[PDB]
Enzyme design. Structure first.
Site, PDB file in Angstrom:
ATOM      1  N   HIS A  77       1.010  -1.167   0.388  1.00 39.88           N
ATOM      2  CA  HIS A  77       0.504  -0.366   0.244  1.00 39.88           C
ATOM      3  C   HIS A  77       0.875   1.496   0.277  1.00 39.88           C
ATOM      4  CE1 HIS A  77      -2.822  -3.026   0.769  1.00 39.88           C
ATOM      5  NE2 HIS A  77      -3.996  -1.738   1.296  1.00 39.88           N
TER       6      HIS A  77
ATOM      7  N   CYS B 149      -3.103   1.840   9.734  1.00 38.96           N
ATOM      8  CA  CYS B 149      -3.970   1.038   9.228  1.00 38.96           C
ATOM      9  C   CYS B 149      -4.737   0.288  10.479  1.00 38.96           C
ATOM     10  CB  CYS B 149      -4.159  -0.003   9.143  1.00 38.96           C
ATOM     11  SG  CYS B 149      -2.775   0.424   7.760  1.00 38.96           S
TER      12      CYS B 149
HETATM   13  C1  LIG Z   1      -2.029  -0.838   6.655  1.00 39.72           C
HETATM   14  C2  LIG Z   1      -1.100  -0.534   5.832  1.00 39.72           C
HETATM   15  C3  LIG Z   1      -0.607  -1.410   4.283  1.00 39.72           C
HETATM   16  N1  LIG Z   1      -1.340  -2.421   3.713  1.00 39.72           N
HETATM   17  C4  LIG Z   1      -2.336  -2.678   5.282  1.00 39.72           C
HETATM   18  C5  LIG Z   1      -3.448  -3.154   4.852  1.00 39.72           C
HETATM   19  S1  LIG Z   1      -3.339  -4.742   5.550  1.00 39.72           S
HETATM   20  C6  LIG Z   1      -4.787  -5.581   5.600  1.00 39.72           C
HETATM   21  C7  LIG Z   1      -4.888  -7.549   4.823  1.00 39.72           C
HETATM   22  N2  LIG Z   1      -3.930  -8.350   5.303  1.00 39.72           N
HETATM   23  C8  LIG Z   1      -4.522  -6.927   3.702  1.00 39.72           C
HETATM   24  O1  LIG Z   1      -5.176  -6.935   2.668  1.00 39.72           O
HETATM   25  O2  LIG Z   1      -4.004  -6.811   3.393  1.00 39.72           O
HETATM   26  C9  LIG Z   1      -2.741  -1.735   5.719  1.00 39.72           C
END
Ligand SMILES: *c1ccnc(CSC[C@H](N)C(=O)O)c1
Length: 272
Positions: free
Chosen positions: A163, A264
Site C-alpha cells: 500500500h 491501518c
Molecule cells: C496498512 C498499511 C498497509 N497495508 C494495509 C493493508 S493490510 C490488511 C490485509 N492484510 C490486506 O488486505 O493486505 C494496511
C-alpha cells in the site's frame, strides 16, 4: 490545523486472523496481536484523551481489525471504501453503523468497478495522494476526489503487494515520514512533482517504521506514535531526535506479518 482529532474507531481482531488474514513466513501469535492491539487501543483512548469506538470482531472477516481500509474520514465527511479484496468488503457494514452513530457525512463507494484501500490514501492536510496498486484502482481514486471536492487528488503507482502507507505516513504538518528503500524513494519523488507546495521529509531506514501516527492534542504537544527500538532501532533513532514531540513507541510486530501497520488499525475522527 491538521492532526486534530476527537474520536478513534478501531475493531477487535478475530481468531480467523491467525490463519486466514491476507498477507504477502512465521505464523501469527493471535494472543500477542490482541495484546499489542489493546495497548494500541489504550494509547488512543486512556492516554491521548480520544474516546475509542471499539468494534466487535467478526470471525468471518479475518482482516476486520484494519479499519483504515474501509473508511477515509476528513473534516465532517467520511468515505466508505470498496476494498480491493472481495472478502474484505463486508467489513464496511459495522463501520457505516458506527460512523453514522457519530453522524458523519457518509459517502459510500458502490461502483462495481471501484476498489480503494484506505492504506493507499495519504492525506497531507493540503491534498490527497492515492497509491495505485492491486487494491486501489484509477476510478477508485476518482470517487475519492468526487467525495472531497476542496482538495486535489494525485495518484502514485505502488508496485509489488504494498500500500502507499506501507513505506510512508504523516509525522507532522507538511512533514512526510518516508522510508529509505528504492520503492519508497521513487513514490516520494513522484508525489512532490504534482504538488505545487514543498513538503518536508523525515527519512527513516526502515520502510515499516515510516508508517507512524501523528496527533495534535491541544496544550499537550505534537504526539508521534512510532515503532519501538526493539522492532526497528535504526529507525527509532531518527524519531528520538524529534525533541519537540511527545514520542510513544508502539509495538505491532505480530500484525506486521499480515502487512498491518500503525495507521491501518484505527480511523481517526475530529468532530467539531
Ligand atoms: C496498512 C498499511 C498497509 N497495508 C494495509 C493493508 S493490510 C490488511 C490485509 N492484510 C490486506 O488486505 O493486505 C494496511
Amino acid at each position: 490545523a491538521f492532526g486534530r482529532a476527537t474520536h478513534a474507531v478501531v475493531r477487535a481482531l478475530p481468531e480467523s486472523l491467525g490463519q486466514h488474514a491476507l498477507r504477502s513466513g512465521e505464523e501469527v501469535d493471535v494472543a500477542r496481536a490482541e495484546r499489542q492491539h489493546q495497548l494500541y487501543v489504550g494509547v488512543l483512548g486512556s492516554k491521548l484523551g480520544l474516546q475509542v469506538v471499539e468494534l466487535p470482531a467478526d470471525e468471518s472477516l479475518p482482516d476486520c481489525v484494519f479499519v483504515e481500509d474501509v473508511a477515509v474520514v476528513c473534516e465532517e465527511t467520511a468515505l466508505i471504501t470498496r476494498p480491493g479484496a472481495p472478502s474484505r468488503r463486508k467489513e464496511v457494514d459495522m463501520m457505516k453503523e458506527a460512523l453514522e452513530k457519530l453522524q458523519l457525512n457518509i459517502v459510500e463507494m458502490k461502483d462495481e468497478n471501484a476498489t480503494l484501500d484506505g492504506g493507499d490514501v495519504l492525506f497531507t492536510g493540503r491534498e490527497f495522494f492515492v497509491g495505485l496498486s492491486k487494491r486501489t484502482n484509477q476510478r477508485g481514486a476518482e470517487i475519492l476526489a468526487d467525495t472531497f471536492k476542496d482538495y486535489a487528488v494525485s495518484t502514485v503507482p505502488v508496485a509489488d503487494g504494498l500500500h502507499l502507507k506501507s513505506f510512508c505516513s504523516m509525522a507532522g504538518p507538511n512533514l512526510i515520514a518516508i522510508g529509505s528503500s528504492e520503492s519508497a524513494q521513487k513514490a516520494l519523488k513522484i508525489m512532490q512533482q504534482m504538488s505545487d507546495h514543498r513538503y518536508d521529509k523525515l527519512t527513516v531506514p526502515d520502510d515499516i517504521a515510516a508508517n507512524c501516527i501523528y496527533l495534535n492534542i491541544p496544550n499537550k504537544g505534537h504526539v508521534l506514535l512510532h515503532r519501538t527500538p526493539e522492532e526497528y532501532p535504526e529507525s527509532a533513532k531518527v524519531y528520538e531526535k524529534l525533541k519537540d514531540h511527545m514520542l510513544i513507541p508502539v509495538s505491532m510486530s505480530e500484525l506486521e506479518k499480515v502487512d498491518g501497520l500503525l495507521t491501518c488499525c484505527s480511523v481517526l475522527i475530529n468532530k467539531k
